[PDB]
Amino acid sequence: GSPPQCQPGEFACANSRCIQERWKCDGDNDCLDNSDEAPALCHQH
Ligand SMILES: [Ca+2]
């Protein structure tokens, strides 16, 4: 119920990646697996 994901408030990519919360609703694949930009997380379009 408290996901850190890289630092205490970031993004975990299903490719297997810690990157930063910018990428969440940024609208690029960014993750390369496009985790954030599938609406399991957000998807800016
Ligand atoms: Ca993104």
Side-chain angles (χ1 to χ4, degrees):
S2 191
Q5 292 192 358
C6 198
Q7 322 192 75
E10 291 282 52
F11 172 38
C13 175
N15 176 251
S16 307
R17 324 291 280 275
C18 105
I19 54 270
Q20 63 185 171
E21 168 159 286
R22 155 216 123 57
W23 298 37
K24 299 194 296 198
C25 318
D26 129 272
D28 187 61
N29 313 144
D30 207 2
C31 163
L32 108 88
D33 145 280
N34 188 112
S35 270
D36 56 313
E37 325 301 349
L41 188 149
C42 192
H43 197 5
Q44 171 157 266
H45 195 325

Coordinates of all heavy atoms in Angstrom, one line a residue:
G1 N 0.8 -1.2 0.0 CA 0.0 0.0 0.0 C 0.8 1.3 0.0 O 0.3 2.4 -0.1
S2 N 2.2 1.2 0.1 CA 3.1 2.3 0.0 C 4.3 1.9 -1.0 O 5.3 1.3 -0.6 CB 3.6 2.6 1.4 OG 4.3 3.9 1.3
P3 N 4.1 2.1 -2.3 CA 5.1 1.8 -3.3 C 6.2 2.8 -3.5 O 5.9 3.9 -4.0 CB 4.2 1.7 -4.6 CG 3.1 2.7 -4.4 CD 2.8 2.6 -2.9
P4 N 7.4 2.6 -3.1 CA 8.6 3.5 -3.3 C 8.9 3.5 -4.8 O 8.8 4.6 -5.5 CB 9.7 3.0 -2.4 CG 9.4 1.5 -2.3 CD 7.9 1.4 -2.4
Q5 N 9.4 2.4 -5.4 CA 9.6 2.0 -6.8 C 10.9 2.5 -7.4 O 11.2 2.0 -8.5 CB 8.3 2.4 -7.6 CG 7.2 1.5 -7.3 CD 6.0 1.6 -8.3 OE1 6.0 2.3 -9.3 NE2 5.0 0.8 -8.1
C6 N 11.7 3.4 -6.8 CA 13.1 3.7 -7.2 C 13.8 4.4 -6.0 O 14.8 4.0 -5.5 CB 13.2 4.6 -8.4 SG 14.7 4.6 -9.4
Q7 N 13.1 5.5 -5.5 CA 13.3 6.2 -4.3 C 11.9 6.3 -3.6 O 11.0 5.6 -4.1 CB 13.9 7.6 -4.7 CG 14.9 7.5 -5.8 CD 15.7 8.8 -6.0 OE1 16.6 9.1 -5.2 NE2 15.5 9.6 -7.0
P8 N 11.6 7.0 -2.5 CA 10.3 6.9 -1.9 C 9.2 7.7 -2.6 O 8.7 8.7 -2.0 CB 10.6 7.3 -0.4 CG 11.7 8.4 -0.6 CD 12.5 7.8 -1.7
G9 N 8.8 7.3 -3.8 CA 7.8 7.9 -4.6 C 8.0 8.1 -6.1 O 8.1 9.2 -6.6
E10 N 8.3 7.0 -6.8 CA 8.8 6.9 -8.2 C 8.0 6.0 -9.1 O 6.9 5.7 -8.8 CB 10.3 6.5 -8.0 CG 11.2 7.7 -7.4 CD 11.5 8.8 -8.3 OE1 10.6 9.4 -8.9 OE2 12.8 9.1 -8.4
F11 N 8.6 5.5 -10.2 CA 8.0 4.5 -11.1 C 8.8 3.1 -11.3 O 10.0 3.0 -11.7 CB 7.7 5.2 -12.4 CG 7.2 4.4 -13.6 CD1 6.4 3.3 -13.5 CD2 7.7 4.8 -14.9 CE1 6.1 2.6 -14.7 CE2 7.3 4.1 -16.0 CZ 6.6 3.0 -15.9
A12 N 8.1 2.0 -11.2 CA 8.5 0.7 -11.5 C 7.9 0.2 -12.8 O 6.7 0.0 -13.0 CB 8.1 -0.3 -10.3
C13 N 8.8 0.0 -13.8 CA 8.5 -0.5 -15.2 C 8.5 -2.0 -15.2 O 9.5 -2.7 -14.9 CB 9.6 0.0 -16.1 SG 9.6 -0.5 -17.8
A14 N 7.4 -2.6 -15.8 CA 7.4 -4.1 -16.0 C 8.4 -4.6 -16.9 O 8.7 -5.9 -16.9 CB 5.9 -4.5 -16.4
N15 N 9.2 -3.8 -17.7 CA 10.5 -4.3 -18.3 C 11.5 -4.7 -17.2 O 12.3 -5.6 -17.5 CB 11.0 -3.3 -19.3 CG 12.4 -3.7 -19.9 OD1 13.4 -3.1 -19.6 ND2 12.4 -4.7 -20.7
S16 N 11.5 -4.1 -16.0 CA 12.1 -4.4 -14.7 C 12.9 -3.2 -14.2 O 14.0 -3.3 -13.8 CB 13.0 -5.7 -14.7 OG 12.3 -6.8 -15.2
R17 N 12.3 -2.0 -14.2 CA 13.0 -0.8 -14.2 C 12.6 0.2 -13.1 O 11.4 0.5 -12.9 CB 13.2 -0.1 -15.5 CG 13.3 -1.0 -16.8 CD 14.6 -1.7 -16.8 NE 15.7 -0.9 -17.3 CZ 16.1 -0.7 -18.6 NH1 15.4 -1.3 -19.6 NH2 17.0 0.1 -18.9
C18 N 13.6 0.8 -12.4 CA 13.3 2.0 -11.5 C 13.7 3.3 -12.3 O 14.9 3.5 -12.6 CB 13.9 1.8 -10.1 SG 15.4 2.7 -9.6
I19 N 12.7 4.1 -12.5 CA 12.8 5.4 -13.1 C 11.8 6.3 -12.3 O 11.1 5.6 -11.5 CB 12.4 5.4 -14.6 CG1 11.0 4.7 -14.8 CG2 13.5 4.7 -15.4 CD1 10.9 3.2 -15.1
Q20 N 11.7 7.5 -12.6 CA 11.2 8.6 -11.8 C 9.8 9.0 -12.2 O 9.6 9.1 -13.5 CB 12.2 9.8 -11.7 CG 12.4 10.4 -13.1 CD 13.4 11.5 -13.2 OE1 13.7 11.9 -14.3 NE2 13.9 12.0 -12.2
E21 N 9.0 9.5 -11.3 CA 7.5 9.7 -11.4 C 7.2 10.7 -12.5 O 6.0 10.5 -13.0 CB 7.1 10.2 -10.0 CG 5.7 10.8 -9.9 CD 5.1 10.7 -8.5 OE1 4.7 9.6 -8.1 OE2 5.0 11.8 -7.9
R22 N 8.1 11.5 -13.1 CA 7.9 12.3 -14.3 C 7.2 11.4 -15.3 O 6.4 11.9 -16.1 CB 9.2 12.9 -14.8 CG 9.2 13.2 -16.3 CD 10.6 13.0 -17.0 NE 10.6 12.0 -18.1 CZ 9.8 12.0 -19.2 NH1 9.1 13.1 -19.5 NH2 9.7 11.0 -20.0
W23 N 7.7 10.2 -15.4 CA 7.5 9.3 -16.6 C 6.0 8.8 -16.5 O 5.4 8.3 -17.5 CB 8.6 8.2 -16.5 CG 10.1 8.6 -16.6 CD1 10.6 9.7 -16.1 CD2 11.2 7.9 -17.2 NE1 12.0 9.8 -16.4 CE2 12.4 8.7 -17.0 CE3 11.4 6.6 -17.9 CZ2 13.6 8.2 -17.5 CZ3 12.6 6.2 -18.3 CH2 13.8 7.0 -18.1
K24 N 5.4 8.9 -15.3 CA 4.0 8.5 -15.0 C 3.1 9.6 -15.5 O 3.0 10.7 -15.0 CB 3.8 8.3 -13.5 CG 4.7 7.2 -13.0 CD 4.3 6.6 -11.6 CE 4.5 7.7 -10.5 NZ 4.5 7.2 -9.2
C25 N 2.3 9.2 -16.6 CA 1.5 10.2 -17.4 C 2.3 11.1 -18.2 O 1.9 12.2 -18.5 CB 0.5 11.0 -16.5 SG -0.4 10.3 -15.1
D26 N 3.6 10.8 -18.6 CA 4.4 11.6 -19.5 C 3.9 11.4 -21.0 O 3.9 12.3 -21.8 CB 5.8 11.4 -19.3 CG 6.7 11.0 -20.6 OD1 6.8 9.9 -20.9 OD2 7.3 12.0 -21.1
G27 N 3.4 10.2 -21.3 CA 2.9 9.8 -22.6 C 3.9 9.2 -23.5 O 3.5 8.8 -24.6
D28 N 5.2 9.0 -23.1 CA 6.1 8.1 -23.8 C 6.2 6.8 -23.1 O 6.0 6.6 -21.8 CB 7.5 8.8 -24.0 CG 8.3 7.8 -24.9 OD1 7.9 7.6 -26.0 OD2 9.3 7.2 -24.3
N29 N 6.4 5.8 -23.9 CA 6.7 4.4 -23.6 C 7.8 4.3 -22.5 O 7.6 3.4 -21.6 CB 7.3 3.6 -24.7 CG 6.6 3.7 -26.1 OD1 7.2 3.7 -27.1 ND2 5.3 3.8 -26.1
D30 N 8.9 5.1 -22.5 CA 9.8 5.7 -21.5 C 10.4 4.6 -20.7 O 11.7 4.4 -20.8 CB 8.8 6.7 -20.8 CG 9.2 8.0 -20.1 OD1 10.4 8.4 -20.0 OD2 8.2 8.6 -19.6
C31 N 9.6 3.9 -20.0 CA 9.8 2.5 -19.6 C 10.2 1.5 -20.7 O 10.7 0.4 -20.4 CB 8.5 2.1 -18.9 SG 8.0 0.4 -18.6
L32 N 10.0 1.8 -22.0 CA 10.1 0.9 -23.2 C 9.1 -0.2 -23.3 O 8.6 -0.6 -24.4 CB 11.6 0.4 -23.3 CG 11.9 -1.1 -22.9 CD1 11.8 -2.0 -24.2 CD2 13.3 -1.2 -22.4
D33 N 8.6 -0.7 -22.1 CA 7.5 -1.7 -22.0 C 6.2 -0.9 -21.9 O 5.1 -1.6 -22.1 CB 7.8 -2.5 -20.7 CG 6.6 -3.0 -19.9 OD1 6.1 -2.1 -19.1 OD2 6.2 -4.1 -20.0
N34 N 6.2 0.4 -21.8 CA 5.0 1.3 -21.7 C 4.1 0.8 -20.6 O 3.0 0.4 -20.8 CB 4.4 1.4 -23.1 CG 3.3 2.4 -23.4 OD1 3.5 3.3 -24.1 ND2 2.2 2.1 -22.8
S35 N 4.6 0.9 -19.3 CA 3.9 0.4 -18.2 C 3.0 1.6 -17.7 O 1.8 1.5 -17.7 CB 4.8 -0.1 -17.0 OG 5.1 -1.4 -17.1
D36 N 3.6 2.7 -17.4 CA 2.9 3.9 -17.0 C 1.9 4.3 -18.0 O 0.7 4.6 -17.7 CB 3.9 5.1 -16.8 CG 4.8 5.5 -17.9 OD1 5.4 4.5 -18.5 OD2 4.8 6.7 -18.1
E37 N 2.2 4.3 -19.3 CA 1.4 4.7 -20.4 C 0.5 3.5 -20.8 O -0.1 3.6 -21.9 CB 2.1 5.5 -21.5 CG 3.2 6.4 -20.9 CD 2.7 7.5 -19.9 OE1 1.5 7.7 -19.7 OE2 3.6 8.2 -19.4
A38 N 0.3 2.5 -20.0 CA -0.9 1.7 -20.0 C -1.7 2.0 -18.8 O -1.1 2.0 -17.7 CB -0.5 0.2 -20.1
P39 N -3.0 2.3 -18.9 CA -3.9 2.8 -17.8 C -4.2 1.8 -16.6 O -5.1 1.9 -15.9 CB -5.2 3.2 -18.5 CG -5.3 2.3 -19.7 CD -3.8 2.1 -20.1
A40 N -3.3 0.8 -16.5 CA -3.0 0.1 -15.2 C -2.3 1.1 -14.3 O -2.4 0.9 -13.0 CB -2.2 -1.1 -15.5
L41 N -1.6 2.1 -14.8 CA -0.9 3.2 -14.1 C -1.5 4.5 -14.5 O -2.3 5.1 -13.7 CB 0.6 3.1 -14.4 CG 1.5 4.0 -13.5 CD1 2.9 3.4 -13.3 CD2 1.6 5.4 -14.1
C42 N -1.3 5.0 -15.7 CA -1.9 6.3 -16.1 C -2.3 6.4 -17.6 O -3.5 6.4 -17.9 CB -0.9 7.5 -15.8 SG -1.7 9.1 -16.0
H43 N -1.4 6.4 -18.6 CA -1.6 6.7 -20.0 C -2.0 8.2 -20.2 O -3.2 8.5 -20.4 CB -2.4 5.7 -20.7 CG -2.4 5.8 -22.2 ND1 -1.6 6.5 -23.0 CD2 -3.1 4.9 -23.0 CE1 -1.8 6.2 -24.3 NE2 -2.8 5.3 -24.4
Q44 N -1.0 9.1 -20.3 CA -1.2 10.3 -21.1 C -1.2 10.0 -22.5 O -0.5 9.1 -23.0 CB -0.1 11.4 -20.7 CG -0.1 12.6 -21.6 CD 0.5 13.8 -21.0 OE1 -0.2 14.7 -20.4 NE2 1.8 14.0 -21.1
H45 N -2.0 10.6 -23.3 CA -2.2 10.4 -24.8 C -2.4 11.8 -25.5 O -2.1 11.9 -26.7 CB -3.4 9.5 -25.0 CG -3.5 8.9 -26.4 ND1 -3.1 9.5 -27.6 CD2 -3.9 7.6 -26.7 CE1 -3.3 8.7 -28.6 NE2 -3.8 7.5 -28.1
Ligands
CA1 CA 5.9 7.9 -19.8

